[PDB]
């Protein structure tokens, strides 16, 4: 049967910090961030949260649906590690502000950066189950890095509409490998915080990248890591690490020499890194952003197959695949992701640091707060009149949002 | 197959990954991090040593070494 992503839309924040400014302010040489292929990170304002991020990512999808198609959305899965409640899913707020049907399953999924992929797969299985033919699912991965790790951690959301008419990404059904085990590589044992080990996290990612793919290879006869995938998209904490993973895979699976590996990297992997470098690590949404980036920056003059590797600390991982056609690539291009990202406010270092200081007022567990939209007037100038959702207030734990 | 034997293989790949250390004296007390080699390249050294000893185990089993000596021990034990 046919299934996959009918529509894909991204929100990469209203503001960003150029990492060269951070390097300069911290006495580091620029070449270290250049080395790791990090350029900019998206930065969340205090009047934004994962809900407003999710809504702004999903809004263009919903705006294009007929009333009838909009009412066919019967599942909303929010995929995040930036939750705002121990029990209430963000999906309830998202449903409210996008005006979706009350006849809709709503919940939130957690497994660090694997959450997005897990949500997508559950959505795929809803359609394949044929329990409710015509039903669509809306899967939104949304995360923010609210500091009260730093150079790589961004903010963003990517919304997927999943259905039996996959205009954007047609899934290779049953072509899935997955692998996980308990490991303390990174975790978030406190609000607005993160603990873990860079090295252990990298080594676990590489172990999973190999084993999840091996499980896919065992299930899909005759697949070849070079020949079967025109592009590869990865969960991308930063580009330099994806370059290392891809190098390791090519070395092991194809015995490729260094020059050919690098050529293969530039051809199949770099396209997916373009938008990643402009937002930073957005956690569970990062692999979906890479897919979007691969689609916009790669060559789709004939249909192409994309291999997808998802990883989440803790850990769990999955390798899967699908096809994008020339028509799907043209639809994706109408989203104007590149122009959105370029139009964001470029923060000075003084502003960035004020922003960190002010983010404390909306920490996890905040009961009452009234946001000052004029914290940064120039940033507001970039948001107002665009039809963006923002967080207006919290009143007795109830979050109130406003279109501006 | 011994610590000091492995510790020589670790120094080789370290110099090969970080060429400016080619003539530099390398102690068992030295941390790749402080030398200072970034995480992608520390992993790269580890995987080169693993493949040098054709040692096919999870890469995470080589995590947690605070210097190249402790990493030599870790390798020696497998």
Automatic annotation (TrEMBL), chain A:
<keyword id="KW-0012">Acyltransferase</keyword>
<feature type="binding site">
    <location>
        <position position="281"/>
    </location>
    <ligand>
        <name>(R)-4'-phosphopantetheine 2</name>
    </ligand>
</feature>
<feature type="binding site">
    <location>
        <position position="152"/>
    </location>
    <ligand>
        <name>(R)-4'-phosphopantetheine 2</name>
    </ligand>
</feature>
<feature type="binding site">
    <location>
        <position position="201"/>
    </location>
    <ligand>
        <name>(R)-4'-phosphopantetheine 2</name>
    </ligand>
</feature>
<dbReference type="InterPro" id="IPR016039">
    <property type="entry name" value="Thiolase-like"/>
</dbReference>
<protein>
    <submittedName>
        <fullName>CurD</fullName>
        <ecNumber>2.3.3.10</ecNumber>
    </submittedName>
</protein>
<dbReference type="InterPro" id="IPR013746">
    <property type="entry name" value="HMG_CoA_synt_C_dom"/>
</dbReference>
<feature type="binding site">
    <location>
        <position position="32"/>
    </location>
    <ligand>
        <name>(R)-4'-phosphopantetheine 2</name>
    </ligand>
</feature>
<feature type="binding site">
    <location>
        <position position="32"/>
    </location>
    <ligand>
        <name>(R)-4'-phosphopantetheine 1</name>
    </ligand>
</feature>
<comment type="similarity">
    <text>Belongs to the thiolase-like superfamily. HMG-CoA synthase family.</text>
</comment>
<dbReference type="InterPro" id="IPR013528">
    <property type="entry name" value="HMG_CoA_synth_N"/>
</dbReference>
<feature type="domain" description="Hydroxymethylglutaryl-coenzyme A synthase C-terminal">
    <location>
        <begin position="264"/>
        <end position="358"/>
    </location>
</feature>
<dbReference type="GO" id="GO:0006084">
    <property type="term" value="P:acetyl-CoA metabolic process"/>
</dbReference>
<keyword id="KW-0808">Transferase</keyword>
<feature type="binding site">
    <location>
        <position position="152"/>
    </location>
    <ligand>
        <name>(R)-4'-phosphopantetheine 1</name>
    </ligand>
</feature>
<dbReference type="GO" id="GO:0004421">
    <property type="term" value="F:hydroxymethylglutaryl-CoA synthase activity"/>
</dbReference>
<dbReference type="Pfam" id="PF08540">
    <property type="entry name" value="HMG_CoA_synt_C"/>
</dbReference>
<dbReference type="Pfam" id="PF01154">
    <property type="entry name" value="HMG_CoA_synt_N"/>
</dbReference>
<feature type="domain" description="Hydroxymethylglutaryl-coenzyme A synthase N-terminal">
    <location>
        <begin position="1"/>
        <end position="163"/>
    </location>
</feature>
From TrEMBL, chain B:
<dbReference type="Pfam" id="PF00550">
    <property type="entry name" value="PP-binding"/>
</dbReference>
<dbReference type="InterPro" id="IPR009081">
    <property type="entry name" value="PP-bd_ACP"/>
</dbReference>
<protein>
    <submittedName>
        <fullName>CurB</fullName>
    </submittedName>
</protein>
<feature type="binding site">
    <location>
        <position position="39"/>
    </location>
    <ligand>
        <name>(R)-4'-phosphopantetheine</name>
    </ligand>
</feature>
<feature type="binding site">
    <location>
        <position position="42"/>
    </location>
    <ligand>
        <name>(R)-4'-phosphopantetheine</name>
    </ligand>
</feature>
<feature type="domain" description="Carrier">
    <location>
        <begin position="4"/>
        <end position="78"/>
    </location>
</feature>
<dbReference type="InterPro" id="IPR036736">
    <property type="entry name" value="ACP-like_sf"/>
</dbReference>
